[PDB]
Amino acid sequence: ELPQMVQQLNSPDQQELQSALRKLSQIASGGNEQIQAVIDAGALPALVQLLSSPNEQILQEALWALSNIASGGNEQIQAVIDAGALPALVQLLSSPNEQILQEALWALSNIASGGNEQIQAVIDAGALPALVQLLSSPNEQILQEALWALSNIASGGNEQIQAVIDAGALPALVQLLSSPNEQILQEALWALSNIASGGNEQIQAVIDAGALPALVQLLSSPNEQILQEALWALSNIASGGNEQKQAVKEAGALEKLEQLQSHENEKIQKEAQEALEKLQSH
Ligand SMILES: [Ca+2]
């Protein structure tokens, strides 16, 4: 039984403690039904308490348990929030331990994968300045994890996207469009696409940050995957007002889109057409 395992989390014997902690995280990784049974067993206050443990073996497993629980539904995510996990997770973004730092980013990214209430709770905990600073990390793993977290925050309402812009994420996201790293380029394109899925003001902020010359340059890429990612970001920008449409035209996207209508890849043909048609709309 699970409530017996929850009781073992404050056991003076480490083998007993760690085995219950491993089991609970293993169960938490097996779908929303199993996530609900771990929550119902009263595991969340005990897991959050284990976040201030100086024992890396405990901390790693407890962070792994909480990330998995935060991968569930919005009400399951909200329970991780209500158990007071966010201050400990934000504080853990200052850890010089790369293992702890990545797991802390996983947890925050999963919490922010929820609805606007869960996204806002991550913003309100003060995660944004740390996430923006991590966009400058020379560690690709941390950078990629930080970008997934910002992309999730930017997937919410206009007020949640405005928080990412107000944190100064756009100059760093635009610079990442010049990365020779295709994985980082995709995530930066995805984060910018999410911001561009907001209101005209959010779309304009992407343009004012200087994303259009880098986006237009990516339309000439011999890589069809990058092309698809750039077209998606452009289609979101083109969905704005006439002031936003004009800026894309002024960057020379039309000429690149019209050329992309004669591409071998049918998915490229389709998306370039919808983007070009959205731009030339009146
Ligand atoms: Ca059409």
236 contacts 206 by C-beta, under 8 angstroms: no
Question: Which pair of tokens denotes residue 128?
Answer: 């944004």
If you measure from the C-alpha of residue 255 to the centroid of ligand 1, how many angstroms do you get, rounded to a whole number?
A: 18
Q: How far is the CA of 259 from the centre of ligand 1 (A)?
A: 17
Burial label for 222, CB within 10 Å (0-12, 13-18, 19+), is exposed
* Residue 219 alpha carbon to ligand 1 centre in Å: 20
How far does residue 281's CA lie from ligand 1's centre (Å)?
A: 11
Residue with tokens 């930066």: 188
Q: Whose structure tokens read 């339309």?
A: 219
198 C-alpha to center of ligand 1: Å? 22
CA of 174 to the centre of ligand 1 (A): 30
Do residues 77 and 114 touch, judged by C-beta distance below 8 A? yes
Query: What value does the CA radius of gyration of the chain take, rounded to a whole number of Å?
Result: 21
Ordered by where they begin, the domains of the chain are: 1-282 (1.25.10.10)
How far does the centroid of ligand 1 lie from the alpha carbon of residue 97, in Å? 51
Solved using: X-ray
Tell how far the Cα of 235 is from the centroid of ligand 1, in angstroms. 13
Closest by CA to 121, choosing from 90, 147, 162, is 90
Alpha carbon separation from 37 to 29, 84, 123, 139, 231 (Å, rounded) = 12, 19, 28, 37, 43
Ligand 1 centroid vs 231 CA: distance in angstroms? 15
Convert 13-63 into a string of H (helix), E (strand) and C (coil). CHHHHHHHHHHHHHHHCCCHHHHHHHHHCCHHHHHHHHHHCCCHHHHHHHH
Cα-to-centroid distance, 245 and ligand 1 (Å): 17
* d(C-alpha 117, C-alpha 114), whole Å: 8
How many angstroms separate the alpha carbon of residue 280 from the centre of ligand 1?
11
